[PDB]
Design a protein around this ligand. Structure first.
Ligand SMILES: [Mg+2]
Ligand SMILES: [Zn+2]
Ligand SMILES: [Zn+2]
Lengths: 137, 82, 91, 101, 103, 64, 102, 214
RNA sequence: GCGCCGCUAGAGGUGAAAUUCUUGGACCGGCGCAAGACGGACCAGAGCGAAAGCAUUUGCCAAGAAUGUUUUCAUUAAUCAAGAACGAAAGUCGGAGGUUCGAAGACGAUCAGAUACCGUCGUAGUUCCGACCAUAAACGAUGCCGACUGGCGAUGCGGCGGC
């Protein structure tokens, strides 16, 4: 063996899981307790080939499947969640790839700790990219 | 209310108006007699005063002048005169 | 008397060199001939010598300040950063 | 030296290899900003006035400030005469006849 | 830079009304060496050996030193006359409290 | 992915959807516990009390 | 014709307010025209709670919230139905709409 | 080409002994390959973790930062770096019609621990209060802001680093300015919000293992 | 954005889409530094100001409405041609500045035709200091001052009396 730290049976090792629940794509980037060691940055936008369906809920569902089948592979067990959004200047409400990339994770036999919205928030900065009258559909 | 008399009303709603706007103008102020604790001279301090009032014997502060009505230091031997 | 309205110091060029040049130069050329106030003896004796050098007329002290003036904004912006690095990280 | 000073400071008249006694950013009103020390393998980098960053040695002795005489070129020469004495005390290059003529 | 210089100057411009005061270097230098000086005032723009021997005499004749945070012409309006002044000594204030000040 | 494809009995008919009435809305129960439920949408006539089959269990709730 | 008693905006005694920008179409409005809508949505989307709480690492775990202040412009407020064309003798109210939590 | 998980080894993270639960978690790191040795590749890392998985009873909306200052084999030792709140609790206590007041002060210790102390506070609606705006006057806010930093200067400057960090697990500085503010205007939600470390004193190995004794 | 580690083939972006960034490894996660604006949530039919306009702390000043006043002066007042001061944003001019956004323009689209709505890039400009121009739906589309004539709950700054 070379993967997995030596842990007892009924216990669990923690590694945080960043969820970038944005428009046009989503990340289910998992990592260690610190956040630093990139373990599996699999993306919903890699496993669909339509480009309308990158942001789609069904892509973010199977996005959670590949990382959970990799999470149990190395030995990392229980995932604290650090959900984000596009953040800051832009919108802050999460995209379609939040719930389907989180509900599919707990159906895929994987323990959850603290879920938390950690999208970036400004204190009045960064003139937004629309123009004065804004983008107009 | 067509029927109000406005030359002999009650003398209490006469109080419930401005110091102007009454039947006759007359201030809320008065002269108030004060004994400071530990002296003998009765003080005739103005009610809505503006100064740090001293005494004849008590060479200390008698009242704190403030916004509306001046505030005595000790709640002291106090009466409202005349 | 008020002799002229819109030249000031650049009446000496007269009818030459243009009008956006002499409106550029009479901002500089009133600055470099002016007597600033010395910050070291409190007197109004600052005298432009050759460029860069400034010199107090009395208290005899020479300051190597700006070129067309005595405190260019580039110097004070830097000086307000050097005395900030002496407290931010304390070096 | 540029190893001890903190990042973002404003430095004129520095050395390009240690001991060179002054080579870079020496004209009037110019300044090289030190950024991004390397703690081990002791090099830094700077920001020369042409905007090109340059990794130099970290023990380059340098003087902290900005060169006096700044904002110099913000007055036009404004006549042909005072350009002749600007280029009489420097060189002999000045009346530059165009190649076409 | 907003509300605490009315302590040093409004005490100071009151001695300008009542108490005796001497401006200049060598008026105060006579006053500091015959004891009647009580509180010298050194402006910010004095040369550093004028600053560093009046402080030396004030240690000798047991008086106080106030560094006025301000230019030696900024102390001009703080006095109330149209000079510059680096050093002044106040020797007999009428009813002020510059003795009772921050130092 | 690898899940046993599961039969499922419904709670009440919750009305039509799908912009043409071609979908119904049934909210099945998953045959084991009576508290595990999900709101869904099938096509075809219902007759409350039926048993329909789910190809997979984790797709989507109908709310925009 | 004048449509409203105010001029469409919630200010009287000023001359200028904060300019902000809309959420979806990013369009600049004054802060006291725009249609706010504060959202306290339960972040787990509470249908998906009895599928995570077995997988929670505790028993009595406070599931968090999500605090997003949508403040639409008035051009996109009507188009996304968050306000409605009202009637001329049911205009004059500042009552907030009733809740109906269940 | 090669599977990069299998070049690594797992450590374990221990907090200082000021807390109850010491076993934080298990970072992983690749081994020594030439220059990148297996210590400075993880010294100075920041570990975001709450309190409810680091104490026995304490609330979960407060979290610490930690910085692995030394590694002694399998063990990965830490030291205090800073504290903060969860944002969804932090903007849960921000309501409409009650005035936010705030303070921020730089206070160092007796040891070389320049700290930046953030405390917020919110005015209180009483039991029988019928009016809606329980705001404040501004000269109330100025001297309340005077009170909040001037207490936590004395909470931090008078004694050493460990009693600073031992104080604010049950929010003892926050409940302290809670106790002295409601003689001026009532406050009800007072959290010492966020502490930002700036200086690190010379890295002496002593004070470190003092925290990793009993 | 620049470093610095970790990791994978895309990321970005739209109704779809491409220009564009990329295995001299971006995007994401983490530790940092730097530079520039702007001061979210608290923020409302609340305040201040003649008006434009004003929001992170502590700060050297100087001003003002309102209230308190058995103070003083004793018609000193009201609007005011000629004339003065201040005046958003854009603009010009000079010097710093250049983060974001972005007139022009360059493409990529959709189009019958797009010099436009949408996307990447991008100059002048948005930033400061100084010297200008006096124009706005500068709107309360309501000149200033003064009196008189319904109510009702409520609000802000004072003052008064109180369970
Ligand atoms: Mg030529
Ligand atoms: Zn001089
Ligand atoms: Zn909008």
């Amino acid at each position: 063996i070379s993967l997995g730290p030596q842990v007892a049976e009924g216990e669990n090792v923690f590694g945080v899981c960043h969820i970038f629940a944005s428009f046009n794509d989503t990340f289910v980037h998992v990592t260690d307790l610190s956040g630093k060691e990139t373990i599996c940055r699999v993306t919903g936008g890699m496993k669909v080939k339509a480009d309308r369906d990158e942001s789609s809920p069904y892509a973010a569902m199977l996005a959670a499947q590949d990382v959970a089948q990799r999470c149990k592979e190395l030995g990392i067990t229980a995932l604290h969640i650090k959900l984000r959004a596009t953040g800051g200047n832009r919108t802050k409400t999460p995209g379609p790839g939040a719930q389907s990339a989180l509900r599919a994770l707990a159906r895929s036999g994987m323990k959850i700790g603290r879920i938390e919205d950690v999208t970036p928030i400004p204190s009045d900065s960064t003139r937004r990219k629309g123009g004065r009258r804004g983008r107009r559909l | 209310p067509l029927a109000k008399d406005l030359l002999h009303p009650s003398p209490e709603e006469e109080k419930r108006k401005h110091k102007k706007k009454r039947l006759v103008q007359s201030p809320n102020s008065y002269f108030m007699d004060v004994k400071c604790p530990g002296c003998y001279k009765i003080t005739t301090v103005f009610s809505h005063a503006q100064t740090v009032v001293l005494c004849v014997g008590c060479s200390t502060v008698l009242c704190q002048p403030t916004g509306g009505k001046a505030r005595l230091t000790e709640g002291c031997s106090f009466r409202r005169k005349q | 008397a008020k002799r002229t309205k819109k030249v000031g110091i650049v009446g000496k060029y007269g009818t030459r060199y243009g009008a956006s040049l002499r409106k550029m130069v009479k901002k500089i050329e009133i600055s470099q001939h002016a007597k600033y106030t010395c910050s070291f003896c409190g007197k109004t004796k600052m005298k432009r010598r050759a460029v860069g050098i400034w010199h107090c007329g009395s208290c005899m002290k020479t300051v190597a300040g700006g070129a067309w003036t005595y405190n260019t904004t580039s110097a004070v912006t830097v000086k307000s950063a050097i005395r900030r690095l002496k407290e931010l990280k304390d070096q | 030296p540029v190893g001890t000073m903190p990042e973002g400071t404003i430095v004129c008249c520095l050395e390009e290899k240690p001991g060179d006694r002054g080579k870079l950013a020496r004209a009037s009103g110019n300044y090289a900003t030190v950024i991004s020390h390397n703690p081990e393998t002791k090099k830094t980098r700077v920001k020369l006035p042409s905007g090109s960053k340059k990794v130099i040695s970290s023990a380059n002795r340098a003087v902290v400030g900005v060169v006096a005489g700044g904002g110099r070129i913000d007055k036009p020469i404004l006549k042909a005469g005072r350009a002749y004495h600007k280029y009489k005390a420097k060189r002999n290059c000045w009346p530059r006849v165009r190649g076409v003529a | 830079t907003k509300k605490s210089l009315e302590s040093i100057n409004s005490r100071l411009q009151l001695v300008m009304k009542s108490g005796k005061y001497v401006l200049g270097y060598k008026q105060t230098l006579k006053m500091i060496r015959q004891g009647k000086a009580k509180l010298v005032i050194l402006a910010n723009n004095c040369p550093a050996l004028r600053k560093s021997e009046i402080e030396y005499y004030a240690m000798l004749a047991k008086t106080g030193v106030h560094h006025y945070s301000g230019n030696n012409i900024e102390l001009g309006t703080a006095c109330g006359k149209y000079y510059r002044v680096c050093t002044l000594a106040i020797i007999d204030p009428g009813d002020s409290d510059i003795i009772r000040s921050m130092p | 992915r690898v899940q046993p494809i599961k039969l499922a009995r419904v709670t009440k008919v919750l009305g039509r959807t799908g912009s043409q009435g071609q979908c119904t809305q049934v909210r099945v129960e998953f045959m084991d516990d009576t508290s595990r439920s999900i709101i869904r949408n099938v096509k075809g006539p219902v007759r409350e009390g039926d048993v329909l089959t789910l190809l997979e269990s984790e797709r989507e709730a109908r709310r925009l | 014709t004048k449509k409203r008693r105010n001029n469409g905006r919630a200010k009287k005694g000023r001359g200028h307010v904060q300019p902000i920008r809309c959420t979806n179409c990013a369009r600049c409005v004054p802060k006291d025209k725009a249609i706010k809508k504060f959202v306290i949505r339960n972040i787990v989307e509470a249908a998906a709670v009895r599928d995570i709480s077995e997988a929670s690492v505790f028993d009595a775990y406070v599931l968090p919230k999500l605090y997003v202040k949508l403040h639409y412009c008035v051009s996109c407020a009507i188009h996304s139905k968050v306000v409605r064309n009202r009637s001329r003798e049911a205009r004059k109210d500042r009552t907030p709409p009733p809740r109906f939590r269940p | 080409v090669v599977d990069p998980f299998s070049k690594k080894d797992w450590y374990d993270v221990k907090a200082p002994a000021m807390f109850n639960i010491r076993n934080i978690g298990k970072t992983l790191v690749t081994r020594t390959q030439g220059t990148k040795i297996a210590s400075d590749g993880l010294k100075g890392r920041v570990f975001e973790v709450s309190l409810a998985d680091l104490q026995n009873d304490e609330v979960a909306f407060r979290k610490f930062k930690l910085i692995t200052e030394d590694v002694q084999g399998k063990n990965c030792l830490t030291n205090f770096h800073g504290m903060d709140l969860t944002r969804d609790k932090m903007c849960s206590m921000v309501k409409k019609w009650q005035t936010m007041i705030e303070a921020h002060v730089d206070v160092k210790t007796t040891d070389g621990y320049l700290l930046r102390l953030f405390c917020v506070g919110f005015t209180k609606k009483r039991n029988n209060q019928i009016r809606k705006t329980s705001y404040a006057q501004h000269q109330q806010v100025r001297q309340i802001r005077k009170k909040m930093m001037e207490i936590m200067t004395r909470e931090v400057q008078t004694n050493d680093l460990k009693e600073v960090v031992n104080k604010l697990i049950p929010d003892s500085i926050g409940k302290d300015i809670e106790k002295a503010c409601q003689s001026i205007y009532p406050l009800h939600d007072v959290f010492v919000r966020k502490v930002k470390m700036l200086k690190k004193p010379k890295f002496e190995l002593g004070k470190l293992m003092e925290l990793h004794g009993e």
